[PDB]
A and B are shown apart, each in its own frame.
Chain A
């Protein structure tokens, strides 16, 4: 949370989400991301360089999360048989 032209107030900058556009606050439970490994393709065999999605308390308790992850993953690629 900035003050003025871009002075830093603040204790830290929290994680956000894009499955419901709501911040992960402050020490909350059921808040974790999900590193899917990339594969380099064509020759196979995992190469880095994680794709990370941020999952909040809210989505998980409302049993959304399964579908959400696929929408997020597909939209930016890449998984075989899409």
Chain B
């Protein structure tokens, strides 16, 4: 677990969640995400349970920890909103970064113009990062992924409930992940939160 009071959440997180529009979900009924759901908003739309979002995020974070090299976890986003997000994560945690197009075959193909060696994949939506998700299960790689109520759950080990499409939702979850892994093993230390704001993540946000 860790030192323990702020790993049972705190108001600071609950404010960030609400702001980033995490809480709203899809309108498709569930059979694999159903457990996670707190309550259903009137006339469709599911309110995800922040308590569940926490525990899964921490279990994910913990799995990246106990590797003494953070490079062999590949952070993956093909979404525009999360290109900046993963780039900041890679600076911070020390992940090997994949922003924009994946380009098929880097965990496959003996003869190729690039090859990456991971041990764990972190995905932002496995219906946009579907190519890594399929490719990973041909070569025996576990995949964590940020899943909503209409994402595929096949070949995903650990799902993290969250909207995880667009806006600040993808950004915030990368920020909180980086903060979490640095707590256990980093230089934030002692299981207390980051001094970096989530705004360094998020999207580019069109510059005036």
Contact = CB atoms under 8 A, between A and B. Distances in A.
Q: State yes or no: do A and B touch (Cβ within 8 Å).
A: yes
- A interface residue count range (under 10 / 10 to 19 / 20 to 34 / 35 or more): 35 or more
Interface string B52-77: 00111011001101100000000000
A80 B56 CA distance: 10
Of A35, A41, A66, A73, most buried by chain B (CB within 10 Å of CB) is A66
B32 A39 contact: no
A34 B140 contact: no
B62 A36 contact: yes
B141 interface: yes
Interface in A45-79: 45-46, 48, 50, 55, 60-67, 69-70, 73, 78-79
A37 B35 contact: no
B139 A29 contact: yes
Secondary structure of the A side of the interface?
loop
Contacts of B158: 34, 65-66, 69
Contacts of B51: 81
Looking at chain B's contact residues, is the secondary structure mostly helix, strand, loop, or mixed? loop
Interface residues of B, number: 40
A44 interface: yes
B2 A32 contact: no
B157 A42 contact: no
Contact of A30 (B8, B9, B155): B155
B191 interface: yes
A82 interface: yes
Contact of B142 (A34, A45, A46): A34
A55 B156 CA distance: 11
B154 interface: yes
Nearest to A55: B157
B154 A42 contact: no
Given A34-B63, A45-B185, A65-B153, 9 more contacts: A29-B140, A34-B158, A41-B2, A44-B3, A60-B155, A65-B158, A70-B55, A73-B59, A81-B9
Interface of B: 1-4, 7-9, 32, 35, 51, 54-56, 58-59, 62-63, 65-66, 137-142, 147, 152-159, 183-185, 189-191
27 contacts: A29-B137, A30-B140, A37-B66, A37-B184, A41-B1, A41-B2, A45-B191, A46-B62, A46-B184, A55-B142, A60-B154, A60-B155, A60-B157, A61-B155, A65-B153, A65-B156, A65-B158, A66-B147, A66-B159, A69-B59, A69-B158, A70-B59, A79-B59, A80-B1, A80-B4, A80-B7, A80-B8
